[PDB]
Structures are given as structure tokens and as C-alpha cells.
Design brief:
This is part of a larger assembly, with 2 copies of chain A.
Chain A: H1 6-33, H2 36-48, H3 53-76, E1 83-85, H4 93-114, H5 118-122, H6 125-131, H7 134-143, E2 145-147, H8 161-167, H9 174-203, H10 217-228, H11 241-269, E3 286-292, H12 296-306, E4 316-322, H13 328-336, E5 341-345, H14 351-356, E6 364-368, H15 376-393, E7 398-403, H16 409-413, E8 425-428, H17 429-434
Parallel strand pairs in A: 3-4, 3-6, 4-5, 6-7, 7-8
Antiparallel strand pairs in A: 1-2
Helix pairs in contact in A: 1-7, 2-4, 3-4, 3-8, 8-9, 9-10, 9-11
The complex binds ligand 6PL (4 copies), Verruculogen (2 copies), cholesterol (2 copies) and potassium ion (3 copies).
One cholesterol (CLR) is lined by residues 6, 10, 128, 150, 199-200, 203, 206 of chain B.
């Protein structure tokens, strides 16, 4: 009570460190001067990697129990007293805590077997975290006391989420893996460093423990987010010498962590998928699909002639399909024709995009050509391939295409599904211009 | 008076949400096992898009009444009491407020007709904003009380300016459209989030409402601009648990909003 035993919990933690370090170190030295082991190591490697279902349930089990162990901390940190004196029999949260640590103790041993280098496995962060949470829990039974100690290290489990879930094949695309990594580190650093300040501020200076800045754990969490954002209100601040000392390191380390992540946050957040989805509307009305050269003046000139007063009033919807996102001016043009013109992002050559815009039900597909092209041969070849893709999806579809040169008209006529008698038309600019 | 009815205003707002959500959801299910509608939907689409002059006057009318509705909030937020008990007959600002919400109620119905997907139209931000301002105003007649509630959401009208004015062909060049979009979002976020802090700080913690940090609305507006600029004087700060909790989300969301706009503010 009056005399605290915080050293007993702390000094026990490092006992498991150097003693465990030396036992593996000395055993290697014995073999220097003086089988199932190979099979067991290979079995342990695939067990912790989730290769098989017996290990797949194990890695997710670690995932479930990782967040769960943090829940015990949050109700423990709610108490104002950082040190408590109560027997195990009446305590509820302690009993649950015995169930977690023994599983993580045996799971730690399994990881040790799979490690090729025993010495470097001892000196990993995941090794350190169990060295500071498995021993003190057992000591709490002996000491009959409850101390917060270094219990915030359980938040370091959360950085396995991009790794554990990667073994489960849910993280396929590179964008998902990177963003999952970045988010998990930020949350874990935020939660772990908040626990350090909560312990340091409440405990006070060593050997006297008189200046105790009683602060709630969630107040500390609010304190760091103000600190990281560099706002610094000053309503909540560290007063203890130890708390300020850690805050100095946190400021330096935090920027260093941020600096290493600058190149990857730049090219990850600057993405957007604005246009997509399939064309779904009512039955009865008719629509056409326009592809090819889709620019601001290509659409505005087309829409002015298509939707004109002199033309007979017929309700035909215009659908545009281009692989590039429209600029600001083009989007405004689409808004002014919201009830008549719709846009989708995709390409004709992709059969998936053809089904989205409902090519098989459209009246005709119009292919616009880039008249001001450096290479007319290249432009014509690309446009011809679009007709092949359209005809591949459905042989009975009307296609109207602009061709820059007359000699390329022969290729279209050689298509087996091309039929001028059924509405297919070729408008050759070279033939018409010189005509 | 002693017992507050803030839940009555709040719980009524979500009543119009799930009930409205289920009615359109159940009607689709009925047709699964068991015309003027097409013409009406096409008419509604061009009405809200400003295609014709009858709809051109309507969209600008929404524009005029959008900023106007905010003026009522500013004089309501001036009062120190976030909850009031007064009859409609003597209250002036309430009577004006009845004139606005009924127009926005019928305008909301017009937007519903023009929507191709009824379910996703229910789950849009503009749908949510009316769900939190049209019901409580009608309840204030029944309850004979005045509460600020979630009234700051009317600042979310201001993000229609780059869209409504685009229908009016005043936004021609791409530079004007982009800068109008960026300015409108910043103003609306600044005004809306200031209202959240003003409501949270003045109301206090739930179920006890004892720790009430009485703060002026314009003081909160000055508080956020200091926060966004990362200056953080600390003279004005959030003390309630709920106010700090929202401030944590505002810091995270604000940088995320800023991050998405970095490539476009550069060029
Ligand atoms: C990941 C983090 C995501 C954001 C979580 C919310 C951010 C934390 C906000 C906490 C703000 C706060 O300070 O509340 C703190 C803690 O109060 C709480 O209960 C916080 C619970 C919020 C939990 C919600 C998020 C859960 C996940 C104030 O504590 P107090 O009542 O003891 O105040 C004492 C003040 N004196 C000393 C003057 C009497
Ligand atoms: C200690 C880190 C000091 C800075 C080193 C440079 C750096 O920024 O490292 C960064 C990340 O560094 C970290 O993970 C910091 C973890 C600290 C957790 C506890 C911090 C608490 C407050 C101090 C690059 O990491 P990575 O994405 O390449 O993947 C590494 C694998 N994990 C995620 C498991 C670490
Ligand atoms: C968009 C925003 C554009 C900028 C608008 C101006 C920025 C807001 C400045 C407000 C600064 C401010 O705090 O004034 C506040 C509010 O005072 C006001 O009247 C502000 C009116 C300014 C309106 C001008 C902009 C109108 C648009 C102080 O309130 P108080 O008198 O109750 O002070 C109480 C202090 N104690 C508690 C100690 C007694
Ligand atoms: C919620 C937004 C979370 C971040 C999403 C990424 C992001 O930054 O979105 C940005 C803008 O996100 C927003 O509009 C934020 C609106 C929040 C308004 C209320 C915030 C109050 C404080 C919280 C990109 O938007 P955009 O220019 O591409 O046009 C979208 C159409 N409008 C303007 C109607 C939304
Ligand atoms: C002044 O004191 C600090 C201390 C620590 C941090 C951290 C970040 N700042 C800190 C500022 C600041 C950086 C600035 C203002 C230059 O920005 O605030 C953010 C909210 C954007 C988080 C950022 N930060 C990261 O973006 C990365 C992403 C993965 C994990 N990250 C971190 O943990 C951290 O490095 C995080 O420690
Ligand atoms: C720390 O806490 C915050 C919280 C929110 C914001 C916001 C911005 N900062 C915030 C900082 C900071 C960003 C920094 C210091 C990295 O810069 O301060 C500005 C005054 C430049 C506004 C900026 N910001 C935007 O530039 C965009 C433009 C369109 C709408 N925007 C926003 O709403 C916001 O994202 C806005 O939320
Ligand atoms: C090599 C790596 C693991 C660092 C090891 C040193 C760490 C784990 C040890 C060495 C000295 C220890 C500190 C000694 C004194 C105190 C003050 C007490 O009120 C809270 C615990 C606290 C804050 C201890 C935390 C853990 C600590 C910092
Ligand atoms: C799904 C989207 C719309 C979010 C819905 C949840 C929102 C609208 C609801 C759920 C709980 C509600 C809060 C419950 C308690 C309080 C405290 C009171 O003093 C002010 C209102 C306030 C702050 C409410 C604001 C609105 C609120 C946050
Ligand atoms: K700063
Ligand atoms: K600052
Ligand atoms: K300060």
C-alpha cells in the first residue's frame, strides 16, 4: 500500500528477457564444442503463416484475441488508481486476463520454433511486447496487486491486421494493402503512445511519486491528436518530468515516422473513381451508344445537331463511353442534358463495359473519329477494332463509323457480320471531302 | 422546463427516416410478387435541372431560400438558452420558419420523383439534411418548444452554389467552376462544423447536462479557423466530452478532405 512494488512487475519483465536471451545463447555455445526438430520447425512455419486451415483458424484466432485484450485495458485504465491491492478470487478482469496470456504464451513458443534465427527472434518487437505483458500478469497472482505498468503494449497487436489479413487473401489490390498498413500504424501509435503518457503522468516522478497529474486515458488520447495536428491548445499538457521527456521523443520520432511515409501518402490518396455502374432504366424507350473521340467540342457539336428544334421530336437517349474522365467543362455539359445524356467510364474493347451500357439493346453504336490526328492510319485502325469488338458482342447491331481514309473501308467490308443492308454505314471523310 | 424533450425532436427526425425508407422498400417488394408515372418522372427531371424557365425560376428560388434559411439560424443561435418554451402565436421567427420548410418539403418530393433509384435517393446527404430540419419544425408546433437541435445542417445548402449556378450557365470556364466548388465546400464545412461544436458545448454531457460551456456561435466560428490553421491559441477550447470527441473526428476528417483537394489547389 504505502510502499509500491512497481519494480517487481517491471524487474520481472526483464528477467524473462536476459534469461531467455542467455539460455538460447548458451545452448548454441554448447553445441560449438559439444530428426523431428527439422520437421517440427517446418510445421511451425506453416502453422503461423495460415497456409492450412488448422493454421488459418489460428491466425484469425490471434486476430480476434488481439483486439479483445485491449478491451480489458480500457476498463482497467478507467480506474483512477494506477496501483491496486486485491486478491484474484474476487477480481473478474484478472481471471479473464489469465485466459488470454496463457494462449499468447504458447503462441509465442510456436513462433519461436518457426524462427530460423533464434537470437534475432528474441530481439523483435513482437517478442518484447509479450516480455512485458506475460510475466507481470503471472506476478500479479503472486504479488496480489494490480498495476497498469506497460499494459498499453497490447495495442501493438493491431499492426498485424495488414499482415494477418494478407494471409487470408482479403487484401488483393496494392492500394488496399498500403492503406491498411498506413491506417493500422497510425491507430496503434496513437493508442500506444497515449498509454505511455497516461502511465507517466498519473504515476509521477520516480522515488517520490508526489506530483501526480491525474489524467483520464481518453483525455490523453485527445491530448495526442491535438499534439499530432500541431494545434496545441494547452488546456491539457504534461507536467511531470518523465511525461515531458517522452513527449520530446514522441515529437522527434513522430515526424521521422511521418517523413518515411510522405512518398507513399502522396501517391495513394490522390485517386478517385467517379464514373461507373451499369445502365439501368425503364423499358419502352430507345437509346444509342457513342464512343471513339469524346472531347468537349466533339460532344457539344454532336448534341447541338442531334437535339435540334427542326428535327422530328423523338425520344432517343444518348450514352457516351470513354476511357478517360471528363474535365470540368464536359461534366457541366452533361448536367445541362441530364434527362437526355448520360456518361460512363470504360472502353469498347472490354466486353464487361459493353454489357454495362447495354449495347445489345441500343439502336446503333456511333464511333467518332479524331479528324485532327497526326497519323490517320493509326486512328483508322483503332476505330476499326472498335467495330470488331462491338460486332463480337452482338452480330445484330447498327454501327456508324467515321473513316479517315478510303482504302481502310475494305477492311470493314470484309467483316463477316458487317451488312450495309441492315443499317451499317461508313462515312469516309476523305471520300466525302474530295467528292 | 426542468425535463427536456430534446429526444422528441431528435427521435422524430429518424422516424421520418426509417419509415420513409421502409415504405419505398416495401412497395418495391409488393410489385415483386404482385402511363403518367413515366411522364411525371421525366417532367420532374427537367424541373429540378433548370432546363426550362418554369424550372429555371425554381432552382434559383431554392438558391435564394437556401441562404435565407441560414439567417434565421444566426438570430436563433444568438440566444444563450439552447432550449426554449414559447407558443407559436407570439414567436416571429417560428412563423417565418413554417413558410420555408413547407416549400422545401414539397421540393423534396419533386426531387424524389425525378430520382431513378428511390432507395439510393433516400440515402443521399441532401435527403438526410431535410430529414433533420423538416420534421422537428413541425414538432415544435406540437411540443410548443424551441430547440437548436441539428439546425446547422442548413449550411449544407451552400454547396449547391457551384451546381445550381452551373445550371444557369454563369460558370463557363473550368477555372471558375473549380474555385467555386472549393470555396463553397470550405465555407459550408466551416459553418456546419461550428454549429456542431456550438450545440455540443452548450448542451453538455448527456443525461446530466451539468457541465455546460456557454459559448457564442461566432466564438465557435473563430475557434475552428484557429483550429484549421493549426495555430491553437487555447483561449477557446472544447471542455465537454462530446465536444472533444467530435473535435477528434473533425481533425481526422478535415485533413482527409484537405488531402483530396491538394492536387487541385496546386494547379
Ligand atoms: C481511436 C480514437 C477515436 C476517437 C475516440 C474519441 C476521442 C476521445 C474523446 C475523449 C474526450 C475526453 O476528454 O473525455 C474524457 C473521458 O470521458 C469519456 O468517457 C470518453 C469516452 C468516449 C469513448 C468513445 C470512443 C470509444 C471507441 C473526460 O473524462 P472525465 O469525465 O473524467 O473529465 C474530467 C475533467 N475534470 C478533471 C476537469 C473533472
Ligand atoms: C521505431 C521506428 C522509428 C522510425 C523508423 C523509420 C520508419 O518510419 O518506419 C516506418 C514505420 O515505423 C513504425 O512502424 C513505428 C512503430 C512504433 C510503434 C510504437 C510507437 C509509440 C510511440 C513512440 C516504416 O515501416 P514499414 O511500413 O516499412 O513496415 C515496417 C514493418 N512494421 C510495420 C512491422 C514495423
Ligand atoms: C464566414 C466567416 C467570416 C468571418 C466572420 C467574422 C469571424 C467571427 C469573429 C467573432 C469573434 C467573437 O468571438 O465575437 C463573439 C460574437 O460577437 C459578435 O457579435 C460577432 C458578430 C460578427 C459578425 C460579422 C460577420 C457577419 C457575417 C463574442 O461574443 P460575446 O460578446 O458574447 O463575448 C463573450 C466573452 N465573454 C464570455 C468573456 C464575456
Ligand atoms: C464526407 C467526406 C469524407 C472525405 C471523402 C473524400 C473527400 O474529400 O471528398 C471531397 C469533398 O468531400 C466533402 O464534400 C465533405 C462534405 C462534408 C460536409 C459536412 C462536414 C462537417 C464537418 C465534418 C471531394 O468532393 P468533390 O469535389 O469530388 O465533389 C463531391 C460532391 N459533393 C461536393 C456534393 C460532395
Ligand atoms: C508534431 O508532432 C507530431 C507527432 C507525431 C505525428 C504523426 C503525424 N504527425 C505528427 C506530428 C503530423 C505531422 C506533421 C504536422 C508534419 O501529421 O498528423 C497526422 C495526423 C497527419 C499524422 C502523422 N503521422 C502520419 O501521417 C503517419 C501515417 C502512418 C502512421 N503515421 C504516423 O504515426 C504519424 O507519423 C504520426 O506519428
Ligand atoms: C488541423 O485540423 C484541420 C481541420 C480541417 C482543415 C481544413 C483545412 N485545414 C484543416 C486543418 C488545413 C490543413 C492543413 C494545415 C494541413 O488548412 O487550412 C485551410 C484553411 C487551408 C483549409 C483546409 N481545407 C481545405 O483546404 C479544403 C479546401 C476546400 C474545402 N477544404 C476544407 O474543408 C479543408 O479540408 C478544411 O477542412
Ligand atoms: C530496451 C528497450 C526495451 C527499453 C527498455 C527500458 C524500459 C522498458 C524500462 C527501463 C526503465 C523503465 C521505467 C522506470 C521507471 C518508471 C516510472 C514508473 O512510475 C512507471 C514505469 C517506468 C516509466 C518504467 C517504464 C519502463 C522503463 C522505461
Ligand atoms: C447515420 C447518420 C445520419 C448519423 C446518425 C446519428 C446522429 C444523427 C444522432 C445519433 C445520436 C444523436 C446525438 C445524441 C445526443 C446528443 C446530445 C444532445 O445534447 C445534443 C444532440 C446530440 C448530440 C445528438 C445529435 C444527433 C446524433 C449524433
Ligand atoms: K502548427
Ligand atoms: K500551434
Ligand atoms: K497554446
Amino acid at each position: 500500500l504505502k510502499v509500491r512494488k512497481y519494480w517487481c512487475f517491471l524487474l520481472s519483465s526483464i528477467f524473462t528477457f536476459l534469461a531467455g536471451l542467455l539460455v538460447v545463447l548458451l545452448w548454441r555455445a554448447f553445441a560449438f564444442v559439444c530428426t523431428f526438430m527439422t520437421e517440427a520447425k517446418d510445421w511451425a512455419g506453416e502453422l503461423i503463416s495460415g497456409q492450412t486451415t488448422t493454421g488459418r483458424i489460428l491466425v484469425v484466432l490471434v486476430f480476434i484475441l488481439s483486439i479483445a485484450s485491449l478491451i480489458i485495458y480500457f476498463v482497467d485504465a478507467s480506474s483512477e488508481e494506477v496501483e491496486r491491492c486485491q486478491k484474484w478470487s474476487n477480481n473478474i478482469t484478472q481471471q479473464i486476463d489469465l485466459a488470454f496470456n496463457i494462449f499468447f504464451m504458447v503462441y509465442f513458443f510456436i513462433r519461436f520454433i518457426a524462427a530460423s534465427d533464434k537470437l534475432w527472434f528474441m530481439l523483435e518487437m513482437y517478442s518484447f511486447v509479450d516480455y512485458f505483458t506475460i510475466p507481470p500478469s503471472f506476478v500479479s497472482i503472486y504479488l496480489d496487486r494490480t498495476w497498469i505498468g506497460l499494459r498499453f503494449l497490447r495495442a501493438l497487436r493491431l499492426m498485424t491486421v495488414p499482415d494477418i489479413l494478407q494471409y487470408l487473401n482479403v487484401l488483393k489490390t496494392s492500394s488496399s494493402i498500403r492503406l491498411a498498413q498506413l491506417v493500422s500504424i497510425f491507430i496503434s501509435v496513437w493508442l500506444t503512445a497515449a498509454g505511455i503518457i497516461h502511465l507517466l503522468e498519473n504515476s509521477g516522478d520516480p522515488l517520490d511519486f508526489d506530483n501526480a497529474h491525474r489524467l483520464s486515458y481518453w483525455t490523453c488520447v485527445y491530448f495526442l491528436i491535438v499534439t499530432m495536428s500541431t494545434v496545441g491548445y494547452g488546456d491539457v499538457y504534461c507536467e511531470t518530468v518523465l511525461g515531458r521527456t517522452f513527449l520530446v521523443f514522441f515529437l522527434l520520432v513522430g515526424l521521422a515516422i511521418f517523413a518515411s511515409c510522405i512518398p507513399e501518402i502522396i501517391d495513394l490518396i490522390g485517386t478517385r473513381a467517379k464514373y461507373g455502374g451499369t445502365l439501368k432504366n425503364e423499358k419502352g424507350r430507345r437509346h444509342i451508344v457513342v464512343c471513339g473521340h469524346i472531347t468537349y467540342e466533339s460532344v457539344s457539336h454532336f448534341l447541338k445537331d442531334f437535339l435540334h428544334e427542326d428535327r422530328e421530336d423523338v425520344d432517343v437517349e444518348v450514352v457516351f463511353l470513354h476511357r478517360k474522365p471528363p474535365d470540368l467543362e464536359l461534366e457541366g455539359l452533361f448536367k445541362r442534358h441530364f434527362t437526355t445524356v448520360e456518361f460512363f467510364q470504360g472502353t469498347i474493347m472490354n466486353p464487361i463495359d459493353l454489357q454495362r451500357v447495354k449495347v445489345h439493346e441500343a439502336d446503333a453504336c456511333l464511333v467518332l473519329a479524331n479528324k485532327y490526328c497526326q497519323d490517320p492510319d493509326a486512328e483508322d485502325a483503332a476505330n476499326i477494332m472498335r467495330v470488331i469488338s462491338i460486332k463480337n458482342y452482338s452480330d445484330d447491331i447498327r454501327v456508324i463509323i467515321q473513316l479517315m481514309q478510303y482504302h481502310n473501308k475494305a477492311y470493314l467490308l470484309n467483316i463477316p457480320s458487317w451488312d450495309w443492308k441492315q443499317g451499317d454505314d461508313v462515312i469516309c471523310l476523305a471520300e466525302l471531302k474530295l467528292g
